[PDB]
Design a protein around this ligand. Structure first.
Ligand code: SF4
Ligand code: SF4
Ligand code: FCO
Ligand code: F3S
Ligand SMILES: [Mg+2]
Ligand code: NI
Lengths: 264, 545
């Protein structure tokens, strides 16, 4: 309810591309305006907040000191080289502010593979010594990975946390509600996979016929996500668009799932 | 009548710059209420170029796409053009068409979100909208914009009641400590215009979902598309009738919103801030062009881009030069990189991070400083608009003249923060007017022959460049391949051109120059800094990578 005290959410941006913020605002159940006007009090969020500079820093501190507490959403990994100085907001290393916010949060939701597991800046040779949030700070996190995750998964997690408690998590901290099944197990090309009907190239007649993309590097068989079941943007997902899965909800996929166009 | 301006003398630091992508600190010296010196200090490094070394060139597009999720897709496209050039494959006509249409869809999504959700709060006092008469607001809307149910007195009253309940709650959320709270001298709009714009801000939150859905029909998903491959595209389904019918329908809805709301709001806001036509100008413009009819090579891209390529120097619209790709280099003298790295063409780019300390005047940004013949270049919609207008591109001549007439200003008034903001809307309208033609072209071609990916072979050694004009401007990716692997991979990104630091000669970048002369009505709430900075549409994850 708009006029009620709505649960406070503080959203921090660390070493990120903002693709996760962008994914969150693609939500349609509810739309983002309904979420922030009716369901949560979104009290800090750099991409969209009005205040800048000292006024924005004052808004963060007002939120962190709120009597009712707050939930913390983190987007992006933590660069730790040089005392954290390669990623700073308001003159403070990202690792310092995230540590402070995490210490008193009612719950921590890591949106995206970067905050969950370290993500793209952690890929070898990791020049910034980037870490995932739990990796760097040793706090338990609810992880909503993918690059970016489906808004269904993130908003669903937020709503679950506020309404029901912590959802059941897998060994990688991911809610089983969204991450319990392999991409591959729900792929419409699975009969082609079972029959060893694989496209050998993107120009092939096999590709035009919609054959399985395993020989072209598809990581669906080792990736936990709900992509084929829920789709993206109510219209599509990568294999429906003829492209292999990259494994983007898996930890360290940049180094474990590459080369992307091979199984090697 | 005159532009508000305090007597403040001293430094102002704004960190974080909010309502941008990524992490930017602006520092300025102010004397008697006007900015006299400025520094653009990017505050995060990730190092994608370092990460790419030794990897499979086919993988580059998937890593570089994650340079940024606001301008999602564009780096996947630049990397794909880059590797296509390096392996010397010419993509099929259907692939050119599909890639360019995904770019068009990205312009629409990106520019709409920028104007409403990133920029508007610099110009629009949302709390003042609570003082508006919704009946007066509806009558005003009826005079300045096409008739629509969303602009009715009932609709505007519902927006106002919702805003009221939210403000009155005392939990102001993203409006907490907004610069316009309690009124601000630099905010000029009548309450009625605030309410119309706020109503559209909310509508735009829903419309951007549709814009992204359109993009995802061809792109696989949004954010971070997954439909490009070396040689072309993978998405055969995107050439078929029913998906393209849905893509057209969604696009038409988004474009109706551009024409009914974005352009009239932009013009109404610009009408009240005509003084901003004299603040924030620069002199040099660069574009690589976009929407080419021949993407078989970078040279063919530059030559056949429908939003044309070119170089303007010293505001001289009488002399558009062709782009010389060999004239591009990047300096690091004032950046957080090791000594020796100045003057590097991107094929010879070096990325050797070396931090010093916050606000070190000798090294103050994680962005490199790209220069062109020793000059800084502004890139983006204003660059594209001036280049097209100077070249006589008929859609740009028509829409630019429409704006100049509405605002009653000469074309020189466009060398400004107001012109930069207007140019973003001008090109959005032009993309919208071209969508149906481009969609029909692909629907017909794809029906005739659904060829979408060309055959190619990886060379042992090669080099290639991929060019695109992304929503924020001229984007280029540059690869050296050795032993069939990435030996060097350099990104030079529009926000690097616009918001990087000084170059080797100590010369201010476009945003640093644009900020000189900025009036500051209240140094505690320096909205004027945000106006100019936001007009460049900064993306720091893009600029630094
Ligand atoms: S998880 Fe992916 S989309 Fe989200 S911030 Fe990281 S790189 Fe960007
Ligand atoms: S395309 Fe990928 S997810 Fe689908 S059946 Fe083949 S391997 Fe599995
Ligand atoms: N548009 C955009 Fe992003 C930036 N700067 C890129 O490329
Ligand atoms: S790449 Fe990611 S978005 Fe789904 S299809 Fe694969 S897990
Ligand atoms: Mg670079
Ligand atoms: Ni960007």
């Amino acid at each position: 309810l708009t006029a009620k005290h709505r649960p406070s959410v503080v959203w921090l941006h660390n070493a990120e591309c903002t693709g996760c913020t962008e994914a969150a605002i693609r939500t349609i159940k509810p739309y983002i305006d309904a979420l922030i006007l009716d369901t949560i009090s979104l009290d800090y969020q750099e991409t969209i907040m009005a205040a800048a500079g000292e006024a924005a820093e004052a808004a963060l501190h007002q939120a962190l000191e709120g009597k009712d507490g707050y939930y913390l959403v983190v987007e992006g990994g933590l660069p730790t080289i040089d005392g954290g100085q390669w990623g700073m907001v308001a003159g403070h290393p990202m690792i310092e502010t995230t540590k402070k916010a995490a210490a008193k949060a009612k719950g921590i939701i890591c949106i995206g593979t970067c905050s969950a597991y370290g993500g793209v800046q952690k890929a070898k040779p990791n020049p910034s010594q980037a870490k995932g949030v739990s990796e760097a700070l040793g706090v338990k996190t609810i992880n909503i990975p993918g690059c970016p995750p489906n808004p269904i998964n993130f908003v669903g997690a937020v709503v679950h946390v506020l309404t029901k408690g912590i959802p059941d998590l897998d060994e990688n901290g991911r809610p089983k509600l969204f991450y319990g099944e392999l991409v591959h197990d729900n792929c419409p090309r699975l009969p082609h996979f079972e029959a060893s009907e694989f496209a050998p190239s993107f120009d092939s007649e096999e590709a035009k016929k919609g054959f399985c993309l395993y020989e072209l590097g598809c990581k669906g068989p080792v990736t936990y996500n709900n992509c084929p079941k829920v789709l993206f943007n109510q219209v599509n997902w990568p294999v429906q668009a003829g492209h292999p899965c990259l494994g983007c909800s898996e930890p360290d996929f940049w180094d474990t799932m590459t080369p992307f166009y091979e199984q090697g | 009548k005159p532009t508000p301006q305090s007597t403040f003398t001293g430094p102002i630091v704004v960190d974080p710059i909010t309502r941008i992508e990524g992490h930017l600190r602006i520092m300025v010296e102010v004397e008697n209420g006007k900015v006299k010196d400025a520094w653009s200090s990017s505050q995060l490094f990730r190092g994608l170029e370092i990460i790419l070394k030794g990897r499979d060139p086919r993988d580059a597009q998937h890593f570089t796409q994650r340079a940024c999720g606001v301008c999602t897709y564009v780096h996947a496209l630049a990397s794909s053009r880059c590797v296509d050039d390096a392996v010397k494959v010419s993509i099929p006509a259907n692939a050119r068409m599909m890639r360019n249409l995904v770019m068009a869809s990205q312009y629409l999504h990106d520019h709409l979100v920028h104007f409403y959700h990133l920029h508007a709060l610099d110009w629009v006092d949302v709390t003042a909208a609570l003082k508006a008469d919704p009946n007066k607001a509806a009558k005003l809307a009826a005079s300045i914009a096409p008739a629509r149910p969303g602009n009715s007195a009932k609709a505007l009253k519902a927006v106002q009641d919702k805003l009221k309940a939210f403000v009155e709650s005392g939990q102001l959320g993203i409006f907490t400590n907004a610069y316009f709270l309690g009124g601000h001298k630099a905010y000029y709009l009548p309450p009625e215009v605030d309410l119309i714009a706020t109503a559209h801000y909310l509508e735009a939150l829903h419309m951007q979902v549709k814009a992204a859905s359109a993009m995802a029909i061809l792109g696989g998903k949004n954010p971070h598309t997954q439909f490009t491959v070396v040689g072309g595209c993978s998405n055969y389904q995107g050439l078929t009738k029913n998906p393209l019918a849905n893509y057209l329908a969604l696009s038409k809805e988004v474009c109706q919103f551009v024409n009914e709301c974005y352009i009239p709001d932009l013009l109404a806001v610009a009408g009240f801030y005509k003084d901003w036509g004299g603040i924030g100008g620069t002199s040099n413009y660069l574009a690589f062009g976009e929407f080419a009819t021949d993407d078989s090579s970078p040279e063919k891209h530059l030559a056949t881009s429908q939003f044309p390529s070119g170089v303007i120097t010293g505001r001289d619209l009488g002399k558009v030069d062709n782009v010389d790709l060999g004239a591009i280099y990047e300096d690091v003298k004032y950046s957080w990189y090791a000594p020796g790295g100045d003057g590097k063409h991107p094929y010879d780019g070096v990325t050797d991070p070396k931090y010093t300390k916050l606000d070190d005047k000798d090294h103050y940004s994680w962005m490199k400083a790209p220069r062109y013949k020793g000059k800084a270049m502004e890139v983006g919609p204003l660059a594209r608009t001036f280049i097209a207008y100077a070249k006589g591109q008929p859609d740009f001549k028509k829409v630019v003249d429409m704006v100049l007439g509405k605002l009653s200003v000469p074309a020189t008034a466009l060398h400004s923060t107001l012109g930069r903001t207007a140019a973003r809307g001008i090109e959005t309208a032009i993309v919208c007017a071209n969508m149906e033609k481009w969609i029909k072209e692909m629907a017909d071609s794809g029906a005739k022959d659904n060829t979408l990916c060309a055959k190619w072979e990886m060379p042992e050694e090669s080099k290639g460049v991929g060019l695109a004009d992304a929503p924020r401007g001229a984007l280029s990716h540059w690869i050296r391949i050795k032993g069939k692997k990435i030996d060097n991979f350099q990104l030079v990104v529009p926000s690097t051109w616009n918001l990087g630091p000084r170059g080797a000669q100590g010369d201010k970048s476009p945003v640093e120059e644009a900020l000189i002369g900025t009036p500051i009505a209240d140094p505690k709430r320096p909205v004027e800094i945000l106006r100019t900075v936001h007009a460049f549409d900064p993306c720091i994850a893009c600029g630094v990578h």
